[PDB]
UniProtKB/TrEMBL annotation, chain A:
It comes from Squalus acanthias. The chain holds residues 24 to 63 of 94 of the full protein. This is FXYD domain-containing ion transport regulator. It is found in: Membrane. Its main location: membrane. Coiled coil: none annotated.
From TrEMBL, chain B:
It is found in: Cell membrane; Membrane. Disulfide bonds join C116-C139, C149-C165, C204-C267. This is Sodium/potassium-transporting ATPase subunit beta. GO terms for cellular component: sodium:potassium-exchanging ATPase complex. Its main location: membrane.
From TrEMBL, chain C:
Mg(2+) 5 binds at S752, E756, D781. It catalyses: K(+)(out) + Na(+)(in) + ATP + H2O = K(+)(in) + Na(+)(out) + ADP + phosphate + H(+). The gene is atn1. Pfam families: Cation_ATPase (PF13246), Cation_ATPase_C (PF00689), Cation_ATPase_N (PF00690), E1-E2_ATPase (PF00122). This is Sodium/potassium-transporting ATPase subunit alpha. Keywords: ATP-binding, Cell membrane, Ion transport, Magnesium, Membrane, Metal-binding, Nucleotide-binding, Phosphoprotein, Potassium, Potassium transport, Sodium, Sodium transport, Sodium/potassium transport, Translocase, Transmembrane, Transmembrane helix, Transport. It comes from Squalus acanthias.
Length: 40, 294, 993
């Protein structure tokens, strides 16, 4: 480390947003499944 | 209704209940809220036990340092009359408040101040961010270094005859090492001359192409006579490990300023770990609207 | 439109003569009026047509829906928001655009809710308009001595009008000459049987006399003449319709509950605003700021999402009713049924079928019962004896009625039959259990028939015998049991014949009194085989001299008949009585029949007795017995006319089974008012026009759809398109279910108010950074929260709802202090603490410890301070600290959702446990999933920190509200436990909503 400690000030917000969106989509799908589970 | 629900004399009821009822409800709520407060306090104590006293866990919201100045402008505008003295008082008061922390009387003895190179130098590492060694030592920054804007000769600092000063300062960040641009063929025009590696350059200009002519001679004052910040005053170890620490400063005199006209002056610092933002107009650079109307 | 002169009982000039009548109105009894005079009167007073109802433009009702009680509260909230914005603009520069967005949002919410409610009421109005079928009708008037058929709108007072069986009485006539003319006074007077109209006068009451024809009545059989006495709106039913239209609407119970709810919400809002205003003034703020703070707090304390939620809840309960054929014109009339505690019903057309049907039959010294139910779902009467066959032959032959051409599609009971009611019932019973009567009649040719005389009181006829081995002649007569009994000497027992000894004569007398006491009309059928030796096959029996032996006949058996009740009438009445609903019969029919129908449907429980019954069982006068020993009472209309208010109050206060007989429509209205005077909700169920003044003034009217009148259908609030009385039970059940669900949904939407207000209060008192932004409160109140609150309506019952007593209106409210103590006092507090916890965590991880946050708002807000030292010594610019504050708003909103999970689960059930009821509500699960997906989408979608100002969160923050949620679940679980184990304890009278 030392002078080149640039990583100490970076955060991968991109990957975080990607994962959060995938999870949100999955939850929405499951919800729809449960809602329509019975009318078919 | 109105009278009865307030006080009846048969059941000896007040507001609806008897004496022992209001007491039962008050006692229940007191115990409930007490437990609520105790639980919240415990959950906050575990938090206090999770953080460290010498370093902020997250330092991503303050990665690109800002660029502030000494005068306190309401809308980033400096307008004052050279005749009425009660016009630039708010400026001098601020300026003075800032420079009043660099008094030599404060910087005295071996502890905790240490004499550093009178000429820009390289970084200085006083160890890690621990409590093993006692309070670290910070380099001394003398007032006199700033030549015509120091409040020692002309208390007003310039505002008295149409020659105001602007003391620029870099935002203090823990463990931040400033890195300047290298001498390679790619570098701005301005930065070519006086390439002291150990100095972070600061250069002001005009926002619009027209205003160029109306702006006179930007005379910068700093450590060693250069227009920048010496790398030796970094890094900053934080308040807990470096109390009584002074950050470099750079004075800027806007000599030969056109009279009775709003001038937009944009100052900007250059460097690798320095990046600007179109949303934050104080990240790395800063804007000032000077108008010496007389 | 004098209402008192319309509230009075109808008067008339019936008690007069033909000369006095012709001398008062002017008219020739044998020549009628002249064309010139007829037109002079036609133009002098107006056509014989009722005035049309008062129309209603669509923008008027749209404006009505845009207003009300809840929408008005939201309107004042929007107005206040714009006022605060104007203030901030006139005093400072750079006014935060918060109040303006909130105001436009509230206005949009009100407009959308109004559009939805209006669309629903319009849907019901269209399906309601598809029922008014009005075909022009022309009457037969005699002018200058000639018969002419002119439009009903051209009949005037004084001309001569002739009617014929099958036509409708145009105006109010005064019969002058009739020929066995019967009329159907069921719609106006409620008389189930056809009353004969005679030119002579008989009763002082115009509705009882036979010399007056009435508007909208139809002549069943016969022809008659008459002078038009009343025409146009001045007719009886004209005054009744005008009175119905000139009545107020009222204010349903659901509306009163919503009103008392708004009252409480405003009380606590103005209390918190004035209190924090005096406190802020005690801490140094200026006037201008205190006014803004006051308006902001009063606006926060208001629920904008509760409106759409309540509207959807009510609409959900309305679609089920529409699935079972129960249509409501308004939207709040769906709950009134559940709160009803006294149902006033009608007999003719509502409790019964208004159709004569063969009820009991006598044969082989044994009473037999026949099925008298619409869909024919019952028990047969043992069709295996020869006696029944002979009876079927007598009834099927000695009968002149025949089904109307083209009825091969309708059922055996609902088809049209041209003839008398008795003959129609007999024909229907024979066609029901004996096959095609047309073949039974063509199988035996009728040779000679002697019509029904008023003196002979018997109908006889001779036909050939279809026996291929016997060419003799058959004679069949039918009539009154006494007359027929005096003409017989044999009895067809089990097929064989036997003498008429006094034993069977006494059994016949007991059978006659048995069928008579049942309120039925009994007839006797007998026949005889004429000896072919004394009357050969060629001899013609002309109806002139005694060609047939009047006596020595063979009596086969009696046949009773009466109008039966609808299929689900007894079961529905029993279900209503089980739920604690007082059933009171109110009808303008004979008391002898009303009492029988009451005992048959359950109004007068078997065993109870009237004062007359006791006097008859003891053989003592009626003035000696005490009226307190009689639970059921039959109040006659004639006696009701001379009764004070206190007497009626006592009648309803001491008798549990009341039956009002021979009551006029005005008296029906008086009865409804007498029931309301005490304090109970009233539901009137009717079908005819006599029920119009009763359906309007009652808290809720139920009109029949097929057998109902247009006036009563337009003046009612609920329509039974299938004429099924069980819909009343279904409605009273749904009204309760949706009430408990409304309570649950209200507590859910109100719990989130505390974690949405406390931040601003601590912001003003403690001077810390704003914890909850305005666009986040908007994303919570109008976003995520909507689906769960809507799902709370689909919750099933916990205990039997059709068992508990009706809710008391003066004590059990919809929103009491027990709810406020939970939402505003215990759950909301925990949610607010969880939000503040996540807040402090986010600010502590970035560098601002809790000790340095108190007292920073002055510099944390300042836009020109680009160097704010934190707990570690770092310098933060303005935009950087603002970004952190916005991230704190995002995390606060997510914490709110996390605690809302446990709030929705603890709000699902009010008393029972979750491990008992069960998570069978799929809508609730879908609500939770969507509530979470929406928060994740609003935070992680790119470009949100620019449009809505919501930054992404770090995976470790999302877990700061979990412990608070589990704690909420545990607290409410143990709460809903002591209530069960300890009924009536502190936890019940303190936290049981
Ligand atoms: C950091 O240094 C500041 C300056 O220090 C001075 O210069 C350095 C190089 C050394 O020589 C040091 O010894 C000097 O003091 C220091 O601020 C100074 O503090 C003194 C003490 O209060 C001030 O003196 C007073 O001046 C006023 C009038 O001031 C006028 O000018 C200033 C600008 O300079 C304006 O801001 C004012 O509004 C006025 O226009 C006198 O009225 C006052 O009278 C008092 O003393 C006399 C005897 O002399 C008595 O008779 C009276 O009753 C009063 O009791 C003082 O003479 C001095 O103005 C001030 N300088 C500035 C620029 O403000 C600062 O405090 C130091 N801070 C730290 C943390 O060390
Ligand atoms: C940072 O960089 C500058 C420029 O470096 C030059 O360009 C870079 C992009 C890269 O290509 C480098 O390799 C390249 O040197 C440094 O300043 C330069 O220094 C030289 C040497 O003094 C100057 O060249 C001089 O030009 C004069 C006329 O303009 C000429 O008269 C000078 O004569 C000298 O040299 C000759 C031999 O060539 C000798 O005979 C003479 O007697 C005399 O010594 C000389 O050629 C450049 O002009 C300078 N550039 C600028 C912009 O001033 C700079 O020193 C460096 N800084 C550090 C700290 O390394
Ligand atoms: C009955 C009801 C059923 C309900 C089911 C709902 C479905 C749930 C759906 C999804 C949940 C799974 C999520 C998994 C996501 C992992 C993704 C991942 O890679 O994530 C990594 C992060 C670490 O982030 P960082 O900051 O360290 O690095 C950041 C580094 N950078 C930013 C530089 C890149 O980690 C994380 O997010 C941690 C993710 C959270 C961990 C899950 C914890 C589960 C908690 C309780 C369940 C226990 C069940 C027990 C079984 C009982 C059976 C009887
Ligand atoms: C019946 C069955 C139904 C099934 C339906 C399934 C639907 C599909 C399900 C999931 C789809 C997943 C799509 C993933 C998209 C990833 C986009 C992404 O990762 O973009 C990130 C970057 C922005 O990063 P930055 O550097 O600006 O960060 C800020 C850095 N700072 C602030 C520090 C400077 O993007 C960019 O640049 C370019 C972005 C371009 C625009 C992409 C649009 C994405 C928006 C919405 C799609 C997500 C919907 C998911 C479904 C949810 C339902 C509720
Ligand atoms: C920065 C700090 C943050 C601060 C945040 C504050 C958030 C505010 C949270 C809650 C607001 C509380 C406001 C008061 C709410 C009271 C509820 C209420 O008014 O509901 C209305 C009920 C009516 O109910 P009903 O329709 O069933 O009646 C039927 C009667 N029938 C049937 C016999 C005719 O009326 C009643 O309950 C009767 C009225 C009783 C009024 C009691 C007033 C108590 C208020 C304060 C006490 C403070 C004392 C503290 C000192 C303690 C000693 C140490
Ligand atoms: C540290 C973290 C703290 C978090 C705190 C917040 C927690 C809130 C979220 C979830 C709480 C779950 C509570 C579990 C309750 C289970 C109760 C249960 O199992 O009672 C069994 C019932 C009773 O049956 P019975 O005897 O009446 O049947 C009779 C059948 N006959 C009539 C044919 C005989 O059986 C039934 O209800 C039928 C089967 C129903 C199965 C339901 C399974 C789904 C459960 C939860 C869904 C997950 C939501 C997650 C939300 C997050 C979204 C991201
Ligand atoms: C059963 C039925 C299922 C139906 C499910 C439907 C789910 C739909 C799922 C996804 C669609 C969502 C909309 C997609 C929006 C894409 C926006 C986008 O791709 O933006 C990309 C660019 C960002 O570019 P940059 O990184 O260079 O910017 C740098 C800016 N610097 C550097 C100055 C800071 O955007 C910009 O520039 C300008 C950003 C414009 C902001 C648009 C956001 C809209 C705001 C509110 C609407 C959300 C309402 C919620 C609806 C919920 C429905 C369930
Ligand atoms: C069924 C489930 C539904 C779920 C949906 C969630 C419901 C949402 C409920 C309420 C949220 C609506 C609140 C509207 C917020 C508007 C904010 C706004 O106008 O901010 C104005 C900003 C100006 O900002 P500045 O001064 O910092 O600019 C400085 C620029 N300098 C410095 C560079 C010069 O301009 C901008 O952001 C420009 C971009 C404009 C973005 C408009 C986004 C509109 C978002 C929603 C409207 C449609 C919602 C309809 C759905 C209803 C659901 C029932
Ligand atoms: C972060 C959020 C944390 C939140 C934690 C909250 C924890 C606090 C929970 C409970 C503390 C309150 C205890 C108050 C006790 C004093 C009340 C009292 O003075 O009561 C007197 C009555 C006895 O009078 P009586 O009825 O015989 O007289 C008849 C009189 N007449 C006619 C009016 C009915 O007392 C009774 O009835 C007995 C009723 C006692 C009340 C039981 C309520 C228990 C509720 C929750 C406990 C579960 C905590 C689980 C947390 C797990 C954390 C992981
Ligand atoms: C400062 O600006 C002034 C102009 O405001 C410059 O002086 C002018 O020079 C021109 C010749 O180019 C003369 O025509 C004017 O009369 C001068 N005006 C004054 C007021 O002197 C001056 O050269 C500038 N000086 C610096 C150091 O920038
Ligand atoms: C039924 C109950 C107990 C289930 C509770 C599930 C909780 C713990 C789940 C639901 C949604 C989940 C989160 C949804 C989104 C994100 C963002 C993603 O980039 C990392 C995971 C993270 C941070 C998840 C953590 C765990 C989480 C909060
Ligand atoms: C289950 C519930 C009711 C228990 C609540 C216990 C409460 C009262 C306990 C839990 C943790 C405790 C705190 C934990 C940490 C500290 C710091 C220490 O230097 C002094 C005590 C102090 C300030 C405690 C005060 C009391 C406290 C908040
Ligand atoms: C932020 C903090 C300090 C505010 C604390 C406010 C507490 C004390 C307030 C909030 C809501 C209030 C309760 C709300 C409801 C009721 C029911 C009513 O019929 C009597 C008053 C009573 C029992 C109140 C007592 C005081 C109470 C619990
Ligand atoms: Mg009727
Ligand atoms: Na009404
Ligand atoms: Na709200």
């Amino acid at each position: 480390e030392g002078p080149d400690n640039d990583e100490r000030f970076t955060y991968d917000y991109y990957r975080l947003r990607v994962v959060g969106l995938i999870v949100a989509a999955v939850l929405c799908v499951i919800g729809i499944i449960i809602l329509l589970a019975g009318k078919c | 209704g109105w009278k009865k629900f307030l006080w009846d004399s048969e059941k000896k009821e007040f507001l609806g209940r008897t004496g022992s009822s209001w007491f039962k409800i008050f006692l229940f709520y007191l115990i409930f809220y007490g437990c609520l407060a105790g639980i919240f306090i415990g959950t906050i104590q575990v938090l206090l036990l999770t953080l460290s006293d010498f370093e902020p866990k997250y330092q991503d919201r303050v990665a690109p340092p800002g660029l502030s100045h000494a005068p306190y402008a309401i809308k980033t505008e400096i307008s004052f009359s050279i005749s009425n003295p009660k016009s630039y008082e708010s400026f001098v008061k601020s300026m003075h408040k800032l420079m009043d922390l660099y008094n030599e009387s404060s910087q005295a003895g071996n502890s905790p101040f240490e004499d550093c190179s009178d000429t820009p130098a390289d970084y200085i590492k006083r160890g890690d961010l621990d409590d093993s060694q006692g309070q670290k030592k910070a380099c001394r920054f003398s007032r006199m270094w700033l030549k015509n804007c120091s409040g020692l000769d002309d208390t007003t600092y310039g505002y008295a005859e149409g020659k105001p000063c602007v003391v620029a300062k870099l935002n203090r960040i823990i463990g931040f090492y400033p890195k300047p641009l290298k001498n390679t063929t790619d570098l701005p025009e301005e930065l070519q001359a006086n390439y002291n590696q150990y100095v972070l350059p600061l250069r002001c200009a005009a926002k619009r192409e027209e205003d160029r002519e109306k702006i006179g001679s930007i005379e910068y004052f700093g450590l060693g006579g250069y227009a920048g910040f010496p790398l030796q005053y970094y890094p900053y170890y934080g308040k807990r490990l470096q109390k009584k620490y002074l950050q470099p400063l750079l004075a800027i005199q806007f000599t030969n300023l056109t009279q009775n006209m709003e001038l937009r002056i944009e100052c900007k610092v250059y460097g690798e770990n320095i990046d600007y933002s179109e949303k934050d107009r104080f990240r790395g650079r800063f804007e000032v609207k000077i108008e010496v109307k007389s | 439109d004098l209402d008192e002169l319309k509230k009075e009982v109808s008067m008339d000039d019936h008690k007069l003569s033909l000369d006095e009548l012709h001398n008062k109105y002017g008219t020739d009894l044998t020549r009628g009026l002249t064309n010139a005079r007829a037109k002079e009167i036609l133009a002098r007073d107006g056509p014989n047509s009722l005035t049309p109802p008062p129309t209603t433009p669509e923008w008027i009702k749209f404006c009505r829906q845009l207003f009300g009680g809840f929408s008005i509260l939201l309107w004042i909230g929007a107005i206040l928001c714009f006022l605060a914005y104007g203030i901030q603009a006139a005093t400072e520069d750079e006014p935060a655009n918060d109040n303006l967005y909130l105001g436009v949002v509230l206005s949009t919410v009100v407009i959308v809710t109004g559009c939805f409610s209006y669309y629903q009421e319009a849907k019901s109005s269209r399906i309601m308009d598809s029922f008014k079928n009005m075909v022009p009708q022309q009457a037969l008037v005699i002018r200058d001595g000639e018969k002419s058929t002119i439009n009903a709108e051209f009949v005037v007072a004084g001309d001569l009008v002739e009617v014929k069986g099958g036509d409708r009485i145009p105006a109010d006539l005064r019969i002058i000459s009739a020929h066995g003319c019967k009329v159907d006074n069921s719609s106006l007077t409620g008389e189930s049987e056809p009353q004969t109209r005679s030119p002579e006068f008989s009763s002082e009451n115009p509705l009882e006399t036979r010399n007056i024809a009435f508007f909208s009545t139809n002549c069943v059989e016969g022809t008659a003449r008459g002078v038009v006495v009343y025409t146009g709106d001045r007719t009886v039913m004209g005054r009744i319709a005008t009175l119905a239209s000139g009545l107020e609407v009222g204010r349903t119970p659901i509306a009163i509950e919503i009103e008392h709810f708004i009252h409480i919400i405003t009380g606590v809002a103005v209390f918190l605003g004035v209190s924090f205003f005096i406190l802020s003034l005690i801490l140094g703020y200026s006037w201008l700021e205190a006014v803004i703070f006051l308006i902001g707090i009063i606006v926060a304390n208001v629920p904008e999402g509760l409106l759409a939620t309540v509207t959807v809840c009510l609409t959900l309960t309305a679609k089920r009713m529409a699935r079972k054929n129960c249509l409501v014109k308004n939207l709040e009339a769906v709950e009134t049924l559940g709160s009803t505690s006294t149902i006033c019903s009608d007999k003719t057309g509502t409790l019964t079928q208004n159709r004569m049907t063969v009820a009991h039959m006598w044969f082989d010294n044994q009473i037999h019962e026949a099925d008298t139910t619409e869909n024919q779902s019952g028990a047969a009467f043992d069709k295996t004896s020869a006696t029944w066959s002979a009876l079927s032959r007598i009834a099927a032959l000695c009968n002149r009625a025949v089904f109307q051409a083209g009825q091969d599609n309708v059922p055996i009971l609902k088809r049209s039959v041209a003839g008398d009611a008795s003959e129609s019932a007999l024909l229907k019973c024979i066609e029901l259990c004996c096959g095609s009567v047309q073949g039974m009649r063509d199988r035996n040719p009728k040779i000679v028939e002697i019509p029904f005389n008023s003196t002979n009181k018997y109908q006889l006829s001779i036909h050939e015998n279809e026996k291929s081995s016997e060419s003799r002649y058959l004679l069949v007569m039918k009539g009154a049991p006494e007359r027929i009994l005096d003409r017989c000497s044999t009895i067809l027992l089990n097929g064989a014949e036997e003498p008429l000894k006094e034993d069977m004569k006494e059994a016949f007398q007991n059978a006659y009194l048995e069928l008579g006491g049942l309120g039925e009309r009994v007839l006797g059928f007998c026949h005889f085989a004429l000896p072919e030796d004394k009357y050969n096959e060629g001899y013609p029996f002309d109806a002139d001299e005694p060609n047939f032996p009047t006596t020595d006949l063979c009596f086969v058996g009696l046949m009773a008949m009466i109008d039966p009740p609808r299929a689900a009438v007894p079961d529905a009445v029993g279900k209503c009585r089980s739920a604690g609903i007082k059933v009171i019969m109110v009808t303008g029919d004979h008391p002898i029949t009303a009492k029988a129908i009451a005992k048959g449907v359950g109004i007068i429980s078997e065993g109870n007795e009237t004062i007359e019954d006791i006097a008859a069982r003891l053989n003592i006068p009626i003035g000696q017995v005490n009226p307190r020993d009689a639970k059921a009472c039959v109040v006659h209309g004639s006696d009701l006319k001379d009764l004070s208010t206190e007497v009626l109050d006592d009648i309803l206060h001491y008798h549990t089974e009341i039956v009002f007989a021979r009551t006029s429509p005005q008296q029906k209205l008086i009865i409804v008012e007498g029931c309301q005077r005490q304090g109970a909700i009233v539901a009137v169920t009717g079908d005819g026009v006599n029920d119009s003044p009763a359906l309007k003034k009652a808290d809720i009217g139920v009109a029949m759809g097929i057998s109902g009148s247009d006036v009563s259908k337009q003046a009612a609030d609920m329509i039974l398109l299938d004429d099924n009385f069980a819909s009343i039970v279904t409605g009273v059940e749904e009204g309760r279910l949706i009430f408990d669900n409304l309570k649950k949904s209200i507590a859910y939407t109100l719990t989130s108010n505390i974690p949405e207000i406390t931040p601003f209060l601590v912001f003003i008192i403690g001077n810390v950074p704003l914890p909850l932004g305005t666009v986040t409160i908007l994303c919570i109140d109008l976003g995520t929260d909507m689906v769960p609150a809507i799902s709370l309506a689909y919750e099933q019952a916990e205990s039997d709802i059709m068992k508990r007593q009706p809710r008391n209106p003066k004590t059990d409210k919809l929103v009491n202090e027990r709810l406020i103590s939970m939402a505003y006092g215990q759950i909301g507090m925990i949610q607010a603490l969880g939000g503040f916890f996540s807040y402090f965590v986010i600010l502590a991880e970035n560098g601002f410890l809790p000790m340095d946050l108190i007292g920073k708002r002055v510099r944390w807000d300042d836009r020109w301070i680009s160097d704010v030292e934190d707990s570690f010594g770092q310098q933060w610019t303005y935009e950087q600290r603002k970004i952190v504050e916005f991230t704190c708003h995002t995390s606060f909103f997510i914490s709110i959702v996390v605690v809302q999970w446990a709030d929705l689960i603890i709000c699902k059930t009010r008393r029972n446990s979750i491990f008992q009821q069960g998570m069978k509500n799929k809508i609730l699960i879908f609500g939770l999933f969507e509530e979470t997906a929406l928060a994740a989408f609003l935070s992680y979608c790119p470009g949100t920190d620019v449009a809505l100002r919501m930054y992404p969160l770090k995976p470790s923050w999302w877990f700061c509200a979990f412990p608070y949620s589990l704690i909420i679940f545990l607290y409410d679980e143990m709460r809903r436990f002591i209530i069960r184990r300890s009924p009536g304890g502190w936890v019940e009278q303190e936290t049981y909503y």
